Amino acid sequence: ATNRDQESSGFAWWAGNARLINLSGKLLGAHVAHAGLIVFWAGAMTLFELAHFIPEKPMYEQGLILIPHIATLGWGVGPGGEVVDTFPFFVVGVVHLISSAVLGFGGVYHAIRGPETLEEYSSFFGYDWKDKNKMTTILGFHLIVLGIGALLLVAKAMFFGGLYDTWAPGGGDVRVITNPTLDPRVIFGYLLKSPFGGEGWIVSVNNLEDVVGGHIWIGLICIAGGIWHILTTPFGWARRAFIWSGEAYLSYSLGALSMMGFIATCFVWFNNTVYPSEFYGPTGPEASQAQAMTFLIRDQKLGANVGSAQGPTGLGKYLMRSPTGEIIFGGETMRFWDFRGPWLEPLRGPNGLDLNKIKNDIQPWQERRAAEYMTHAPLGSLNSVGGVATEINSVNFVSPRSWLATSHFVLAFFFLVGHLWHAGRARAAAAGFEKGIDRESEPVLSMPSLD
Amino acid sequence: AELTPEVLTVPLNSEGKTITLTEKQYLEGKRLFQYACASCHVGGITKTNPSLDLRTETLALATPPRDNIEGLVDYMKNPTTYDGEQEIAEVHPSLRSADIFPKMRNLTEKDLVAIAGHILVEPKILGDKWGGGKVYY
Amino acid sequence: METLKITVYIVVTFFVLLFVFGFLSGDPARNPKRKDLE
Amino acid sequence: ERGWFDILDDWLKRDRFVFVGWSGILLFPCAYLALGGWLTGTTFVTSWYTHGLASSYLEGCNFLTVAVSTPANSMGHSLLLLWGPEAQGDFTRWCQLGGLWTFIALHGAFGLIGFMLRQFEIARLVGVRPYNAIAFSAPIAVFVSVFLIYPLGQSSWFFAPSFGVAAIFRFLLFFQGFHNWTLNPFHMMGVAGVLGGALLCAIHGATVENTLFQDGEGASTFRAFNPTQAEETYSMVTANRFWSQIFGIAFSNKRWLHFFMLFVPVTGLWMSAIGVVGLALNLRSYDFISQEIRAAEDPEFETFYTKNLLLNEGIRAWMAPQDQPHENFVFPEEVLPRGNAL
Amino acid sequence: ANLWERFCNWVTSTDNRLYVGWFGVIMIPTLLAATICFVIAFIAAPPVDIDGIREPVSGSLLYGNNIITGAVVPSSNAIGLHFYPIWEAASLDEWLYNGGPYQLIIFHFLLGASCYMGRQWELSYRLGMRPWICVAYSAPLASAFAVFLIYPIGQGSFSDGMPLGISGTFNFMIVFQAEHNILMHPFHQLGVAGVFGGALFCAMHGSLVTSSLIRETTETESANYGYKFGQEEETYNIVAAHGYFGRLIFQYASFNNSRSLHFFLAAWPVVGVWFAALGISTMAFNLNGFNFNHSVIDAKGNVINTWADIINRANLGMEVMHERNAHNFPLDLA
Amino acid sequence: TTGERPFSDIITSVRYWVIHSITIPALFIAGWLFVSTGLAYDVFGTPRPDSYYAQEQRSIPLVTDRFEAKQQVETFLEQLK
Ligand code: CLA
Ligand code: CLA
Ligand code: CLA
Ligand code: CLA
Ligand code: CLA
Ligand SMILES: CC1=C(/C=C/C(C)=C/C=C/C(C)=C/C=C/C=C(C)/C=C/C=C(C)/C=C/C2=C(C)CCCC2(C)C)C(C)(C)CCC1
Ligand SMILES: CC1=C(/C=C/C(C)=C/C=C/C(C)=C/C=C/C=C(C)/C=C/C=C(C)/C=C/C2=C(C)CCCC2(C)C)C(C)(C)CCC1
Ligand SMILES: CC1=C(/C=C/C(C)=C/C=C/C(C)=C/C=C/C=C(C)/C=C/C=C(C)/C=C/C2=C(C)CCCC2(C)C)C(C)(C)CCC1
Ligand SMILES: CCCCCCCCCCCCO[C@@H]1O[C@H](CO)[C@@H](O[C@H]2O[C@H](CO)[C@@H](O)[C@H](O)[C@H]2O)[C@H](O)[C@H]1O
Ligand SMILES: [Ca+2]
Ligand SMILES: [Cl-]
Ligand SMILES: [Cl-]
Ligand SMILES: [Fe+2]
C-alpha cells in the first residue's frame, strides 16, 4: 500500500487524491479513467436524447443539449433546421460510448495494475514537475493536438458537408464555407472589441466565414506554439514569475477553465449564430424583441399607424429611437435593441427599423417566427414550468439556453474558487509554511511593531 | 366533486346534438392540448392576441360558431378570423398548414376531437379561471 | 470630454503597468521563508 | 437526609448517553409532542376548513408546501384545548379546526423553556458560567414575539405564522405588503445582527484556520491539536497584525472577541423581537409623512420609498381575497391596481 | 538599490501601517474613485431616469431624500448594457440624467473589491500565513458581483441592477421575488441556512468560550483583563466547554478539536453564501424557483389552493404594479 | 463513555439484524396500510380527492363560528350527498 494511508502520505482520505502528486503512473490512470467518464457521458447522453426525441417537436421543447450541438455542425438537418436523418446522432453516441470502454480500460490498468511511477519505466513518459523543459514539452504535445482539433472543425466546414447557417438565404440551411475570413484585422479585431452592449467582444461573431477563419488562425497558432514549447525552455523572466509545482500547474488551469466557463455562459446566452435559435430556442433578447414585433403586427393589422402611436410615457408605443438615433422597438425591450437575427434584419434600413418595410413587407413566416420565439422565451421554473414565475402549470419547458448558461456559471464560479484555493496553497507550500507557522521562527515576531 | 358523464357531455354540432366523452378522451385532450396549443393558449387565453380567448361564450359568437365539437375540429383544419372573413392557416397551426407547423403532422382526426372536447369541458370545471388570465390564478 | 478620455486612459494604463511589472519583479521571493524560488 | 427526593435527584443526574435532569421532565415530552404534532399534521391533516388550503402529504403537497396551518379566524385566540368547548373532545374535529396549531405552539413554548432550564442545569453541574443559556434568550424572544404576542395583538391566531416552509414565505410577504416591515429600524437592527453574526462566524473561523501553528508534520492540520494542550493552537499576534494592516483595526483580546460573538447575533434578534411587538398593534414604520406630503402635491416627485408602497398596494389587493377567506373580499377586476399592460 | 527596487520594496513592505501591495496599487485608486463619487452623488445628484421612460427618480438628500429613502439610482434602461463613461455624454448634465454615476461607482467598486480579495492573499504570503482567508471573502464578493453585474447581464440592463441605497435594496428584493420566486429557490434557501446557521454558530461559539473562561480576575474588574495579548496559554478550558455542550446534546454532537470546530465555523456560512450568490447568478438567466401553482387538483379538476398559490397571489401583486409605466405588451420577459 | 453498548457494536451484530429485519418492514407495511385502507382520511378528517366540493359548488366550507364550528363541519360533510 504505497502512500495509501494518511501516515505514509500525510494526506487524510478526504484529500486522498493529493496522494497521487508524485505517482505519475497512477496519476496517468486517474486522468485516463476520468476522460473515459467524459466520453461515456457524451455517448450515453446522446443515445438517451435520441431515444426520447420526437422529430416533429422543436429540439428546444425536448430538453436536448447534445443533439443541438451535432445539428449545428450540419449533421442530420436540412433547410430551416428540420431533422432529415437521425442516423448521425446515433453514430456520434455509439462511437463515444464504445470509446469510453477503451479509455476506461487504460485508466483502470494504469490506476491499479501498471507501474505506479513511470520514471523508472520510461524517461519519455516519465516526468518531474520541477523539470521546466519536460513540462513545456508535454504542454507542446497537447497544443498540437488542440490545434489539430480546431482544424477538424475547418475540415467539416470546407470539405465534409459544411455547417448549419441560421443566416443562410431562405430560412437557414447547411452551407459549405468556401471563403473563410483570413484577414487578421477581422479575426483579431474581435479580440479588441469592448465586451459591453452593442459590441460584445468575441460573443458578437455573427457569420460562419469568421467562425471558420478564426479556427484556421487558432489551429496554426496552437501548432506553432506547440512546436515552440517542445523546442524551448522557459526564459528567465518567466522562471522568476511562476511557481513550478504540480499544484501550481493545476491552479493555473483552474483559472483558465473558470474564465472559459464564464465566456461560454455568455456565448450561449447572447449568440444566435453558433447557437442557432432553431435548435436552442430564442435568446432572452430575441424573445423580448419578438413580443414587440408580434404586437406591432397585430395592431397594424387592426389599422394602427405604429410609426406615430405615442405610448403612455410619451415615447412611441411600438417604435422609438436608441440613444444614437436608430429606429428600435419600444417598451421595455428598448434595452435589447442590439439584437440581430435573420427573422428581423429584412425590416432594417440604414436608420434602423424602416417604417415602409414595416408597413408593406412583413411576411407571414416572420409573424410565425416572432410568435414562436415570444412563446418560447427562456424563462421557467426549476421543475420546468415554462413562463414567468407567476404562470400556472401546463407547459413543461425550460430553454436549453437557460440550462446551459446556469450550469456553466456555477461550474465557472467554483473553478475560480478552486484556482484561489490551489494557487494560494501552491504559493505557501513552495515557500514552506502551508502547514502552519513555525513557533520558533514566527515571522511577525521579528518585525517592528506597527505603533 | 367528480368528473361525471354530465361534465363530459358537450355539444357535437350547432343543431343541439351532444356527445359524451370518456375520461380517457378528456385526459387525452388535455395532454394533446398541452403538446400542441398551450404554448399560446395555457389556461384558455391567447398570449399572442389576448383579445380572443377560448371561453365557450367567446366561441359561441365566433363566425361560424365554434362552441361545439364540429366547429372546433373544423377550426383546427382550416382556421379563420373571428368573423370568418379570412383564412389564417399561414399563421395559426392547423392540418392545412402541417408543413409549416410540424407538431400538427402527427395529429389524427381522433386527436382533434379529444382536443376539442378538452376545450369545451375545461370551462365547466374551472369557471372563470378558464380564459380569465392572471386575475383568477 | 476628449481630454478627460486621454487622461483616464493614461492613468489606468499607468496603474496596470505597475501591477504587471510589480508581480513580474521576483514576487515569489517576497516571503519570509524560502527566497530561492526559480 | 437521603429521602425519595434526593434519590430521584441522583437518578435524573446520572451521566448517561442522553442527560435527563429535572429540566428533562418538562423538556422531553413537550419537545417530542411539538415535533410529533408537526410531523403528524404535515403528513395527514388538511387546512381545508380553516384556510381553504390543502396542506399535507396525504393531499398531494410536498415538503415545501405542507404546513400545520393556523386555526380559522372565527376561533379568535381560543386555546383550542382538545377537551374545550370548540372540539368537545372530538379528535377529528379538533384537527379540522386547527387544534394542532395551538398544540404545537404551546408545547413548543414550554419545550423552549425546558431547553433553557437544561442549559442552566447542566452548566451548574459541570461548573461553567451560564452564558449559553443567556444567549438562548434571543431565540425565545423571537419565538414568543412572532408566534404568541403578534397574533395576540391581531384579531386571532389565524394571522400568526403557520408551521411550514411556503407558509412562512407567505408570512414574509404579508409583512412587506401590510406592515412595510423592511422599513422598520428594529428589523434593520435584526438584519445587522444576523448578517454580522454570520460574518463574524466566517471571519473568526477562517482567521484561526489560517494562523495555525505548525504542530505536526501532516498536510492535514487537524491532527496536530490535543484537547488538553496548554498552548493556543493559532497565533493571536500574527492574526492581529494581519487584520490591522488589511482592515485598519483588529481584535487583540480573545475574551472580548468571543463575548462580541455572543453579543452581536443575540442583540440583533432581541431588537427584531421588539419591532414585531409593535406590529402586534399595527404600530408600523409604514410611511415617512414628509415624503407623502410632498408626493401628494407634486406628481413629479418620485423616490424608491414611493415605488415600494405601490408594490405593497399590489400585494394587499391581489393576495387579500385568497389569504383572508373569512373576510369575503370580492374585488372586481376593475378595482384591482395594475400598471400598464401587466 | 535602484529606484524600481526601492519602490517595489516599499509597495510590498510589511512595515506600512496599512499594507499596500500590488493588489493595493489597483485597489486604492478605484476604491477612492468609487467612494468619492458615491458620497457626492448620494448628497447632491439630480433625479435619474432609471427605466428609460423619461420618468426620473430622485435619489439624493438635497432632492428630498433621507438616509433611508436615498440611493444612487441605476443607469437608464435606454442604455441597457452599453458602456457609459463621462466622455460618452454630451455634457455632465446629460450624464447625470441617465444615471452615469451608477456605472462609475460599481465598476470601480467591483475592481477594488476584487483587488481587496487578492490583497488578503498577498499579505498572508508576506507574513508566512496560510492563504485561505481570501476564500472566505469570495462569498460576500461573489454576492456583490451577482446583484451589480451578473443579474444586469442576464437581464440585459444595469437598470435592473441593485440600487445603491437602503429602500432601493428593498425595491430590488421585491421585484426579484415577483420575477423569479426567489423564496422558492433552493439556493436562496441554502443561503438562509448559511446566514441563520452562521448567526446561530456565532452565538454558540461565543457563549461556550465565554462560559469556560478561566478565573483570572476579581468580580470588580472586567474578565477581559484576564487575557493578555500574545500570551502563550489558552484563556479558556475547551475540555469544560466540550463537557457542557456534549451533555447538552450528546457527547458525539460536540467538537473537542478546536481546529475542526473553527473550520466548521468558517465553512458553514461561506458555503451557504456561495449558494445564495449562485441563486442570484442563475436566476439571472431565468431558471426560477419551484412553481407549484395549481399543482393540487381534486377529482373533478377543481384547483385546490396550497400556500404556494397564496405566495403566487402576492407575487402577482408585485408583478402588476412594479414599474407601472414601463410595459406596453402583456409579458414582462426581462 | 457512559456505559451503554456502542452503536457500532449493536448494528453489526447478527442478533440486531435478526430482530430488525422483521420489525422495520412490519412498521413500514403498517404505515402503508394506514393509508391504503383509507383509515388515515377518517382519523384526521382529511378530504379525499372527491370530497373537497359538492359537484356544482365552488365555495369553501369555511368555519365561521367559534362554538358551533363542530356542527358547521358536520353540516358541510352532509351536503356532499
Ligand atoms: C474520477 C474519480 C477518481 C479517480 C479516477 C480516482 C483514482 C485514484 N484514486 Mg481517488 N478518490 C476519489 C475519486 C477518484 N479517484 C474520490 C471521490 C475520493 C474521496 C472518497 C478519493 C479518495 C482517494 C483516497 C483516500 C485514495 C485514492 C487513490 C486513487 C488511486 C488508486 C486507487 C486504488 O488503489 O483503489 C483500489 C480499489 C480497487 C482495486 C477496487 C475497485 C477499483 C476499480 C478501479 C473499480 C473500477 C470499476 C470499473 C467499472 C471497471 C471497468 C473495467 C472495464 C473498463 C474493462 C487512483 C489513481 C489512492 C492513492 O492515491 O494511492 C496512492 C488513495 O489512497 N482516492
Ligand atoms: C480539475 C479540477 C481539480 C483537480 C484535479 C483537483 C485536485 C485536488 N484537489 Mg481541488 N478543487 C477544485 C478542482 C480540482 N481539484 C475545485 C473546482 C474546488 C472548489 C470547490 C477545489 C477545492 C479543493 C479544496 C478545498 C481541497 C482540494 C484538494 C485537492 C487535492 C485532493 C482532492 C481529493 O482527493 O478530493 C476528494 C474528493 C472528495 C472528498 C469528494 C467531494 C464530493 C463533492 C464535494 C460532491 C459534489 C456534489 C456533486 C457535484 C453533485 C452531487 C452528487 C450527489 C447527488 C451524489 C487534489 C490535488 C485538497 C487539497 O488542498 O490537497 C492538496 C483540499 O483540501 N480542492
Ligand atoms: C453541463 C451540465 C448539464 C446541463 C446544462 C444539463 C441539462 C439538462 N439535462 Mg442533463 N445530465 C447531466 C448534465 C447536464 N444536463 C449529467 C452530468 C447527467 C448524468 C447524471 C445528466 C443526465 C440527464 C438525464 C437522465 C436527464 C437530463 C435532462 C436535462 C434537461 C432537464 C434538466 C433538469 O430538469 O434538471 C433538474 C435540476 C436539478 C436536478 C438540479 C441539480 C442540483 C445539483 C445537485 C446542484 C449541484 C451544485 C454543484 C455542482 C455542487 C457544489 C457543491 C459545493 C460544496 C462545492 C436539461 C436540458 C432531462 C431531459 O430532459 O433529457 C432530455 C433528463 O431526463 N440530464
Ligand atoms: C494519454 C493517454 C496515455 C498515455 C500517455 C499512456 C502511456 C503509456 N502507456 Mg497506456 N493506455 C492508455 C492511455 C495512455 N497510455 C489507453 C487508452 C489504454 C487502453 C488501450 C492504455 C493501455 C496500456 C497497456 C496495456 C500498457 C500501456 C503502457 C503505457 C506505457 C508505454 C506505452 C508505449 O510505449 O506505447 C508506444 C506507443 C504506441 C504503441 C503508439 C500507440 C498509438 C495509438 C494506439 C493509436 C492512436 C493514436 C492517436 C493519438 C489516438 C487518438 C486518441 C484520442 C482520440 C483520444 C506508457 C507510460 C504499457 C505499460 O504500462 O508498461 C508497463 C502497457 O503495457 N497502456
Ligand atoms: C495552453 C496554452 C499555453 C500555455 C499554458 C503557455 C505557457 C507559457 N508560454 Mg507559451 N505560447 C502558446 C501557448 C501557451 N503557452 C501559444 C499558442 C504560442 C504561440 C503564440 C505561445 C508562444 C510563446 C512565446 C513566444 C513565449 C511563451 C512563453 C510561455 C511561458 C510564459 C507564460 C507567461 O508569462 O504568460 C503571461 C502572459 C503575459 C505576460 C502576457 C502579457 C500580460 C497581459 C497584459 C495580460 C492580458 C490579460 C487579459 C485578461 C487578456 C484577455 C484576453 C485578451 C486577448 C483581450 C509559459 C510556460 C514564454 C517563454 O518562456 O517561452 C519559452 C515566451 O517567451 N509562449
Ligand atoms: C480508478 C479508480 C476509480 C475510478 C474508476 C473509473 C472512473 C473507471 C471508469 C470506467 C469506465 C469509463 C468504464 C466504461 C465502460 C464502458 C462500456 C463497458 C461500454 C459498453 C457499451 C456497450 C455494450 C454498447 C451497447 C450498445 C450498442 C453497441 C448499440 C446501442 C445500444 C447499446 C447501448 C446496448 C474509483 C473512483 C472508482 C476509485 C478507485 C480508483
Ligand atoms: C476561434 C474564433 C475566433 C478567434 C479567436 C482568437 C483569435 C482568440 C485568441 C485568443 C487569445 C490570443 C487569448 C489570449 C489570452 C491571454 C491571457 C488569458 C493572458 C493571461 C495572462 C496572465 C494570467 C498573466 C499573469 C501574471 C501577471 C499579469 C503578472 C506576472 C505574474 C503572472 C504571470 C501570474 C473568432 C473570435 C475570430 C471568431 C470565432 C472563432
Ligand atoms: C400530535 C399528537 C400526538 C403525538 C403524535 C406523535 C408524537 C407523533 C410522532 C410522529 C413522528 C415522530 C413522525 C416521524 C416522521 C419522520 C419522517 C417522516 C422522516 C422522514 C425523513 C426523510 C424523508 C429524510 C430525508 C432526508 C433528509 C431530510 C436529509 C438527509 C437525506 C434524506 C434524503 C434521507 C398525541 C398522540 C400525543 C396526541 C394527539 C396529537
Ligand atoms: C502589457 C504587459 C506586458 C508584459 C510584458 C511581458 C514581457 C516579459 C519581459 C519582462 C522583462 C524581464 O525583465 C524583468 O524586469 C526587471 C529587469 O530590470 C527585473 O526586475 C526585478 O528583478 C528582481 C527579480 O528577481 C527583483 O528582485 C527586483 O526587485 C526587480 O528589479 C525582473 O526580474 C526581470 O525579469
Ligand atoms: Ca521543452
Ligand atoms: Cl418598481
Ligand atoms: Cl413592454
Ligand atoms: Fe474561537
Description:
- Chain A: Chlorophyll a 13 binds at residue 415.
- Chain A: Chlorophyll a 5 binds at residue 138.
- Chain A: Chlorophyll a 3 binds at residue 27.
- The structure is cut from a larger assembly and holds chains A (451 residues), B (137 residues), C (38 residues), D (342 residues), E (334 residues) and F (81 residues).
- Chain A is mostly helical and 451 residues long.
- Helix content of chain A is 50%, strand content 4%.
- Chain A has helices at 6-9, 24-51, 67-72, 87-113, 132-158, 184-189, 208-231, 236-241, 246-270, 277-280, 284-301, 355-360, 364-374, 400-431; strands at 163-165, 173-175, 319-321, 327-329, 348-349, 352-353, 380-381.
- In chain A, strands 1-2 form a two-stranded antiparallel ribbon. A two-stranded antiparallel ribbon of chain A has the order 3-4. Chain A has a two-stranded antiparallel sheet with strand order 5-6.
- Chain B has 137 residues and is mainly alpha-helical.
- Chain B is 36% helix and 4% strand.
- Chain B has a two-stranded antiparallel ribbon with strand order 1-2.
- In chain B, β1 (9-11) and β2 (18-20) form a beta hairpin.
- The longest helix of chain B is centred in the C-terminal third of the chain and has 18 residues, at 109-126.
- The two termini of chain B are 20 Å apart.
- Chain D has 13 helices and two strands; from the N terminus they run αααβααααβαααααα.
- Chain D has one domain (3-341).
- Chain E has a domain at 3-186: Photosystem II protein D1-like (Photosynthetic Reaction Center, subunit M, domain 1), CATH 1.20.85.10.
- The termini of chain E are far apart.
- With 334 residues, chain E is mainly alpha-helical.
- Classes of the chains: A mainly alpha (451), B mainly alpha (137), C mainly alpha (38), D mainly alpha (342), E mainly alpha (334), F mainly alpha (81).
- Chains in contact: A-B, A-C, A-D, A-E, B-E, B-F, C-E, D-E, D-F, E-F.
- Chains D and E meet through α5, α6, α8, α9 and α10 of D and α4, α5, α6, α7 and α8 of E.
- β7 (380-381) of chain A pairs parallel with β3 (287-288) of chain E.
- Bound molecules: chlorophyll A (CLA) (5 copies), beta-carotene (3 copies), dodecyl-beta-D-maltoside, calcium ion, chloride ion (2 copies) and fe (ii) ion (FE2).
- One beta-carotene is lined by residues 33, 36-37, 40, 94, 97, 100-101, 104, 107-108, 111 of chain A.
Please report the distance between the alpha carbons of the first and last residues of chain F. Answer: 64 Å
What's the number of extended β-strand segments of chain E?
3
Morphology of chain E: globular
Any guess at the CATH architecture of chain F?
Up-down Bundle
Give the CATH H-level superfamily of chain F: Photosystem II cytochrome b559, alpha subunit
Give the class-level CATH name of the domain at 3-186 in chain E: Mainly Alpha
Alpha carbon gyration radius of chain F: 23 Å
Protein name (chain D): Photosystem II D2 protein
Family (chain D): Belongs to the reaction center PufL/M/PsbA/D family.
Enzyme class (chain D): oxidoreductase
Subcellular location (chain D): Cellular thylakoid membrane
